[PDB]
Design a protein around this ligand. Structure first.
Ligand SMILES: Nc1ncnc2c1ncn2[C@@H]1O[C@H](COP(=O)(O)OP(=O)(O)O)[C@@H](O)[C@H]1O
Ligand SMILES: [Mg+2]
Lengths: 289, 97, 337
């Protein structure tokens, strides 16, 4: 963090929060790990030091230039911004895992309880802005620089990791990207409506697809919005979807060839690739190994 | 807010649904408030009778469809009656004068 | 004519005002019906009342959705004749099974039955007797060649296959039939089943009979198929037996009502001809309305039919009070039985 964010570029007030980040996430992580215990149900709850890596991975994917541009763009002090980014990435790692809505509201307490005490200098300006109810979400695709006039003629949109203040401002952008997917992929239509909770799930997926060396696992009862939001996130993210075709002829040998085509696309030539799986696509347990 | 937001898009797609714009906004909320009320009873039914009924977001998309199919059909019967009535009420009124 | 026509107008008016009022009330009426069909199936008789009459009806009045205050489900969704037909098929007279009957006809998703004793099965066997065949139509979930022998044949032909002994857990190869996802080429409607396309006709039907009291289905399964609890309850047999006692004891009273209602539904239809006949013939006739004796006759004849119907629908309402008093007096025999 001290290497990636240098004193030279930042204010003295911003950099006092950057030094706080590294001490803050640990205080939070100890509180969250002590309270949310693994059980027969809610087995995944156990928090490792992968879940520390993953917080910081998110924080360091927000560039020095978007933090310094928070007073113009987000219309908040850049030192204040930085706490919102922290709060977001802390939530996305820790709070998203959590299976029920009561366990979330406990953890949103710990993320606020820590953010006040770690960031004492901006305590009164954090406390008033940042709630669990109020949204301050992050996405690479916020920028509408992709006009899409006879394909992508106007360069591309720089995929910079920026904060969105309201879900309504995002919905206009996310509804536009949905309508454009249905144009580009006309054979497989995707009639979908982006309610506040689905938008939130799309960002969460289009974060996990956008971070390097970051797989996902979308756990939902079924018909929950998983596959549809994934293919949209993969479309928005300008990366190649791959899905296993289940036929009686197709076996564990043909999987290995479908994975090999994945590495032929990913490791060779250098294309981002987003191998998609479901309960249905897992014909036998050996495929999942 | 999700179920009501899904119910909002479905009523807009529904062109043959003829009612007040106020009433449609009350219906949107009701459609959603139904799908919660079933989940609330599904939990109650497991505590009182030890029977597990599972309702998913797919089972809400089924309700909304099923709603239109029975409405469209039931409106088609009613609307063609009211039109066979209304042809009457004009010609008879003229005959009375 | 002025006395007669104003009379004929006021019969038309009042019906149109009721049909107009019925369209205003339809938005709620359909919401309260279609909620019951999709969700209330898997619950017992007690909880279907709780989930519909105590929960949904309360929500409507608060929201201000226009709904008929009573809204008897059985009356609204299906005619009184078709209830009579299901009774002959062997769907019992009790309120729960009638509703279970309505859910099977109206559900877009393939109906699943919970019935531990095949009461729901014995009804869907007696009904659909034409489109069912005894041999090579009914199979169990697990068969050596379930797919190629039964399923493949019944789709191609369009015969109503009934899956036996589902035993809680459903096979994953069946999923794409239940989903009703169709890759349409012309009008064939080819549906892939474990990676093999099969010609599905529109006249194909599937019924899935669980033979367990309390089966724990998966949310994915419960969303694919409309679950209907067809289990015989003490409360349900009470309502069946109470029907059987009322058919035996005070038979003369109960039969005279069934004769009257059947002659009332006739005279509603008979009056719908004469008032129609006038409308058709009063446009065709045109000028000199005073001499038009063949029209004049029916305008006064509609009135005697409209007076007759009205006086049976008062006497019909009196006999429903009279029989419901006896239904309470003979309740103790049925609830004992
Ligand atoms: N907001 C929504 N509007 C319409 N359909 C939706 C919505 N959310 C989910 N669905 C439905 O979810 C179904 C399954 O897709 P999805 O839920 O993304 O994946 P999965 O099958 O893994 O649950 C689709 O048929 C889609 O119509
Ligand atoms: Mg599913």
């Amino acid at each position: 963090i001290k290497h990636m964010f240098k004193q030279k570029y930042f204010s003295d007030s911003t950099y006092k929060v950057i030094e706080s980040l590294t001490s803050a996430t640990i205080a939070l992580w100890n509180k969250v790990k002590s309270t949310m215990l693994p059980t027969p149900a809610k087995f995944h709850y156990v928090f490792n030091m992968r879940e520390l890596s993953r917080i910081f991975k998110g924080i360091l994917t927000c560039k020095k230039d978007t933090i310094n541009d928070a007073p113009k763009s987000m219309k908040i002090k850049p030192e204040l911004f930085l706490v919102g980014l922290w709060r977001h990435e802390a939530e996305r790692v820790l709070a998203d895992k959590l299976v029920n809505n009561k366990d979330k509201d406990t953890v949103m307490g710990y993320i606020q309880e820590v953010s006040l005490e770690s960031f004492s200098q901006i305590e009164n300006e954090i406390l008033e802005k940042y709630s669990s109810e109020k949204t301050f979400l992050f996405c690479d695709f916020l920028r509408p620089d992709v006009i899409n006039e006879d394909g992508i003629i106007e360069e591309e949109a720089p995929k910079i990791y920026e904060a969105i203040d309201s879900l309504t401002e995002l919905r206009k952008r996310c509804n536009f990207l949905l309508s454009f997917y249905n144009d580009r992929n006309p054979s497989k239509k995707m009639p979908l409506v982006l309610f506040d909770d689905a938008l939130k799930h799309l960002l969460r997926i289009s974060r996990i697809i956008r971070q390097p060396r970051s797989s996902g696992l979308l756990v939902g009862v079924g018909g929950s919005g998983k596959q549809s939001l994934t293919r949209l996130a993969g479309f928005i993210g300008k990366n190649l979807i791959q899905q296993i075709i289940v036929t009686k002829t197709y076996s564990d040998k043909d999987l290995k060839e479908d994975i090999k085509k994945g590495f032929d696309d990913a490791g060779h030539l250098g294309k981002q690739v987003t191998f998609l799986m479901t309960d249905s696509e897992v014909k036998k347990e050996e495929f999942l190994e | 807010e999700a179920l009501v937001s899904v119910a909002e898009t479905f009523i807009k797609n529904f062109d043959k649904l003829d009612t007040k714009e106020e009433t449609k906004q009350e219906l949107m909320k009701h459609m959603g408030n139904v799908h919660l009320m079933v989940n609330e009873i599904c939990d109650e039914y497991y505590q009182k009778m030890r029977r597990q009924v599972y309702v998913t977001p797919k089972s809400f998309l089924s309700y909304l469809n099923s709603y239109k199919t029975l409405y469209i059909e039931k409106y088609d019967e009613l609307d063609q009656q009211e039109e066979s009535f209304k042809i009457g009420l004009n010609k008879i009124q003229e005959a009375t004068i | 004519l002025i006395t007669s026509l104003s009379g004929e107008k006021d019969r038309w008016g009042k019906g149109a005002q009721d049909i107009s009022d019925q369209k205003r009330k339809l938005v709620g009426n359909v919401s309260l019906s279609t909620a019951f069909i999709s969700y209330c199936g898997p619950f017992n008789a007690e909880y279907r009342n709780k989930l519909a009459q105590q929960r949904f009806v309360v929500d409507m009045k608060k929201r201000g959705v226009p709904v008929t205050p009573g809204l008897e489900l059985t009356s609204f969704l299906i005619d009184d004749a078709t209830i009579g037909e299901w009774n002959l098929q062997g769907l019992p007279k009790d309120d729960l099974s009638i509703q279970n009957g309505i859910m099977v006809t109206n559900s877009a998703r393939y109906p699943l039955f919970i019935d531990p004793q095949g009461q729901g099965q014995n009804w869907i066997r007696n009904k659909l007797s034409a489109s069912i065949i005894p041999e090579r139509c009914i199979t169990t979930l697990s068969h050596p060649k379930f797919k190629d022998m039964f399923l493949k044949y019944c789709m191609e032909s369009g015969l109503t296959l009934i899956v036996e002994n589902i035993e809680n857990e459903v096979d994953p190869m069946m999923d794409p039939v239940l989903e009703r996802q169709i890759i349409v080429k012309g009008k064939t409607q080819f549906v892939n089943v474990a990676g093999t396309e099969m010609e599905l006709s529109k006249e194909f039907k599937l019924f899935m009979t669980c033979r367990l009291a309390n089966p724990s289905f998966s949310p994915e399964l419960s969303a694919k198929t409309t679950i209907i609890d067809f289990t015989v309850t003490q409360s349900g047999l009470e309502q069946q037996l109470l029907g059987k006692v009322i058919s035996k004891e005070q038979k003369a009273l109960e039969d005279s009502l069934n004769q009257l209602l059947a002659d009332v539904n006739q005279n509603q239809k008979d009056l719908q001809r004469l008032d129609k006949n006038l409308l058709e013939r009063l446009i065709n006739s045109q000028g000199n309305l005073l001499d038009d004796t063949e029209l004049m006759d029916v305008l006064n004849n509609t009135k005697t039919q409209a007076k007759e119907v009205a006086a049976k629908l008062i006497d019909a309402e009196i006999k429903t009070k009279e029989i419901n008093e006896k239904r309470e007096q003979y309740r103790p025999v049925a609830i004992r039985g």
